[PDB]
Amino acid sequence: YIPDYKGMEPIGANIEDLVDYSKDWLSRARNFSFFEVKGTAVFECFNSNEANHCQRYPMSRKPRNFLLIQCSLITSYKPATTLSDQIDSRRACSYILNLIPDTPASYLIHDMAYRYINLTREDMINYYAPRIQFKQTQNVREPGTFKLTSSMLRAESKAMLDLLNNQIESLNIASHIVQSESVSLITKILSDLELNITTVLDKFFQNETQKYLIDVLKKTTAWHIGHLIRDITESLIAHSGLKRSKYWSLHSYNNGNVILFILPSKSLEVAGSFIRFITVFRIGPGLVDKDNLDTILIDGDSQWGVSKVMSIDLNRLLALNIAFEKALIATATWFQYYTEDQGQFPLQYAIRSVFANHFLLAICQKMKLCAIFDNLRYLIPAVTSLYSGFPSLIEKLFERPFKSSLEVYIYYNIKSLLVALAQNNKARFYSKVKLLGLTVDQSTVVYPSFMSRIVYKHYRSLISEVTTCFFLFEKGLHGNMNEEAKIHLETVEWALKFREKEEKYGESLVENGYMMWELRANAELAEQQLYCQDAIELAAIELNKVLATKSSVVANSILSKNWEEPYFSQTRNISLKGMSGQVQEDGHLSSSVTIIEAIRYLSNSRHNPSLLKLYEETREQKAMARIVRKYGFFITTLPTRCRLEIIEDYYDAIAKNISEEYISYKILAIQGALEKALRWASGESFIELSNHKFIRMKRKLMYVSADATKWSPGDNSAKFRRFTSMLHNGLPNNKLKNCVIDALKQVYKTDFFMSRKLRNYIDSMESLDPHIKQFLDFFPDGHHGEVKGNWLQGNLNKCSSLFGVAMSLLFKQVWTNLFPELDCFFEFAHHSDDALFIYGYLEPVDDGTDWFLFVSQQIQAGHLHWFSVNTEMWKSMFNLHEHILLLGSIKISPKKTTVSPTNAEFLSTFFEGCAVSIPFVKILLGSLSDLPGLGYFDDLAAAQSRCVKALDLGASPQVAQLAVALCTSKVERLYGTAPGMVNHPAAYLQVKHTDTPIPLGGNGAMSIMELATAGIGMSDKNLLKRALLGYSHKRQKSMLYILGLFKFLMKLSDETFQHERLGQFSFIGKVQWKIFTPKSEFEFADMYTSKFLELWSSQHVTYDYIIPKGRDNLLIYLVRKLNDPSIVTAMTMQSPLQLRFRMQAKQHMKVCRLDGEWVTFREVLAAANSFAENYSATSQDMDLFQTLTSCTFSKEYAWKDFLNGIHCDVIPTKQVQRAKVARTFTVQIIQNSIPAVIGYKFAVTVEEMSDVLDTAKFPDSLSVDLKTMKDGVYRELGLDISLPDVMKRIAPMLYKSSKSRVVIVQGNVEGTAEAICRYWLKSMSLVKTIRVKPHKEVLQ
């Protein structure tokens, strides 16, 4: 049922009125919004912005410190050990005690060295003892620390400690001297870093990546400095515990040449805490900035740099810990991009320079560099086009102050590069190429590298280089304290502008729109946040001209949106996305989760309402918005999400029916527009004269790339109302359309709330600036203020895209009506937030006298709008298009919008951006970023899955293999399972490290190909199959021992309760690891006990395959989902408390579950060996093992078989780069889904039966389907489905789910998973051509 909502009565909007308005508008001069790229213009823009930056900022004469850790290396670095730490610390203290301190930091260092070197033998024994054998001493109260009180502290040291415990200038970027000094310093550091200290995939890796990348960088100073930095950051992390951070610590490295002093500090477990440390090193080549050192002590022919006190937080510490891996993966990505651009491997000097640059960027994590590279990502396209908004981007380069030498150096390089690129465009000339399927005239002009003296053939290599640089910075830098405040002020500024417009014109005009006659009378109404009602209606008519031919499809799509389906039974409504909660007693808006709000509603309700019913029950509630705590993003409340879902469902249903013409979802619309444009340009124009003669006019094209659909804080949602009122749908009534209009009306006004963090920051300002004064004045009660028009980045993308398409069609009709005699062209295409506009204009073939005479005569004959057509007609085309878009509330961005002629590189970049949305380097670096902390097996699986996802995003298999190796090495380091460390399974399990199951610390190192095809768990499956075969054939003892290990893991799993689900069924046992959740701090996690939840899960088995629809079962199901360890870990990902477990993992504490106790991983291994030694196989165990080996894991072994049965050979042909395209990695009797059939099988209750009936598409066939499949299991494999255990084992074998992976490939590849695998095998070499031998389908 749909309640009767009020509709909108149509207005008498006339297209000819808009045509007359455009006639008047085009009769005068208009300003083009973009600037010509000239080289001199870019240089002058840089100089003027330098002068302005000098004006706005107070001057600093001393560049700030940018190196968090200062050190030097002259010899190959050996990783630190406890014995090496002791020896190096003794030698280092002996070295330091001979020196004469000058500065207070030097005095503190001397005092610390004296205290450490005078600790007793028991103190030294307990200083390096593990937590198990540690015994507290008077001086040593924590394992790796000691005590240093004021009795032995000097006066200078004590004063310095007291000072430690208890306006924004900028460098003079306009000075050539400041640039010269910064360039000199950074050049010296980079040269120091570059110095040298003194399977088929396996073969390709050893010949290419090992030879040209790994062997080159293995000897560089950067490699060993990175390992030394990893050791230092490990010490700093180990000191960050609650008990240990209050004491002092001393560590040493490189035979005493590097010394770390750790001072008492607040623990990193609690948020907003810093570790303080001082690094003392021998002066030499490395990460040395002598001008920023605290002091330089002199010894006989030697120097010791003592740094100032460094305070580092948890995120910066983790980034510095993984800096070496980040730099190596960035350099490997650069390696692959270089081989793609040039077709050859880079030389040693270029790889060394790239690696040094990447390492310097990765160790120096600051927001200024990240913002600079973010801006460069769009600055590079802005100087390679004909027209762009590069002055605005160069201005954006100067928003924050310049503080360090590194910032000045990067800016100087960027200015040089951009001026060089802009000066390249002056050699533009017309030529001939083969675009799409035509020979067309293109206007082309050597792109220098940014870190080496390499020149690319394409500027997309430059763009990807800058992108990889930008992703070297942690995503935790965004947000911080400047971005949150900035987004708050931007929102409040746009709301204040909306209020000013309301005061000037009245609330009705800003909400309902202005009329065309008012626009003619005032001419200032054409702006952002205001729209013309006539323009909205006419754009709706223009879109209706396309929609009226597909009315049936649009209607069927809308009714296919399932408006009567229960709201909270859908996945998107029970997710962990993030949602605003309730207004608390103190008056703030709560940051909450979608599932938590779902449980809050159901617990206070008696039914699971549908979307329309939920909208009617919450209609009267006000929309509320907030900034997300830490994850510039907004979160809204449940009624706001419901209204946005109504609007977006309606408009997605409508917009999917024009996806092949205007809105690319794939690239068909853009290719069609390009084909039409190129076909049009092939012809010639003949303008008819009054004297029956003709003028010959030549056709040319201009392309504009713009982000027109992207959400803007300056916008008015109310326009959509009239749009919705006039858009044609096939429905016979207006109830659904009226409901959409009503939802739009209810989303108009929002309560935007300040955050607690920002409020505290404001209260700590101590000096309220005028903009801060206005921002605080925006909130009457100090908590929330009303916002209108702006929908706060809510999901309305399909509506905005459809609206933009309608306005572009309106412009197309208006321009056709303006020049009936002229034969002009216009074609546009939308893809996500991007849009490509193609204008086809006319130029005189001759000198142009006849054309000028014709234009003058047309002007004299009263057609005054021909003034805009005399020269540069495409400019007037774009001006009128932009003005018409502004008649809605669409402003084409002055920045980030590029204008080009026909150009192969421009179109290639646009199509590449359309095909791929995420660079694979982002996923590659996020693999090292952080781990879920759920144990060895889970962390390994997560890292491997991220590497496979990166491979799906276009990463070469060699780069992905290197990333897999690095991630596996890091996980083994964290859990101690690698050889030589205390958690190595080979010391307890009496089997080989490769014969050990992964949950028991086994060797998880696997090929990237098998991980991508077979999956992220096939090591255990292969081990089980081999052990079963060996025992069943030869009855060997070792195979029985491996089976016993698997049975021990299975018993471990049975000890715990993991109901799981069809999509996450597990059969190989897993060690249960300690997860220090906030003890279920979640609000509604305490509704039902774990025992009650386990009983419910056992009783209701059908709900393990489908989702309940009734309120009670849904509430219990959602509580159970809340109580999932994996969901708990994800819901506390950004909590600063997690590191405790990491430390407990590194200290090898009692973090594993065994016999209802918390024990060490070593104790788990000992129990595993004890169980496996006495284990004897039974009939039930052998039967089960056969079901898993031959049936459950059957699909994965098949991909392995195909992998092992393939043959590839090198063809004497150079590799050819191709356009990248997305494909689907997807690998009949039963007409219902397997989850529905199985739930029907297990349905015993009326509620469960009804739930499966609603879930199933064809309920009537359900039983029949079950029957036939119940035959197959008892016919193809001879197993009894009637047993629930057998059903659970066989269900994931019969479930052909997932495969919804999207893989980026080249053009030739097909959509078959076998084709994707064959393409991956052909891309196993970065230079050579690989041909597969079978040349047929060899996958079962």
Author numbering: 226 to 391, 401 to 432, 449 to 695, 700 to 885, 893 to 926, 931 to 1492, 1497 to 1609
Can I see the authors' text?
From this dataset, multiple structures of apo HTNV-L were obtained in different oligomeric states: (i) the structure of monomeric apo HTNV-L WT, determined at an overall resolution of 2.6 Å, exhibits a conserved architecture compared to the previously obtained apo HTNV-LD97A8. The polymerase core is clearly visible, whereas the ENDO and the C-terminal region are too flexible to be resolved. The overall resolution improvement, from 3.1 Å HTNV-LD97A to 2.6 Å in HTNV-LWT, results in a more accurate definition of several regions, notably a β-hairpin of the core-lobe region (residues 676–695) that, by analogy with other Bunyavirus polymerases, could be involved in the stabilization of the C-terminal region. The motif F is rather flexible and positions itself in the template entry tunnel, thereby closing it and confirming the inactive configuration of HTNV-L apo.
Hantaan virus is a dangerous human pathogen whose segmented negative-stranded RNA genome is replicated and transcribed by a virally-encoded multi-functional polymerase. The interior of the core adopts a right-hand organization that is common to all RNA-dependent RNA polymerases (RdRp) and comprises a palm, a finger, and a thumb domains. The active site cavity is located in the core center at the intersection of four tunnels: the RNA template entry, the nucleotide entry, the template exit, and the product exit tunnels.
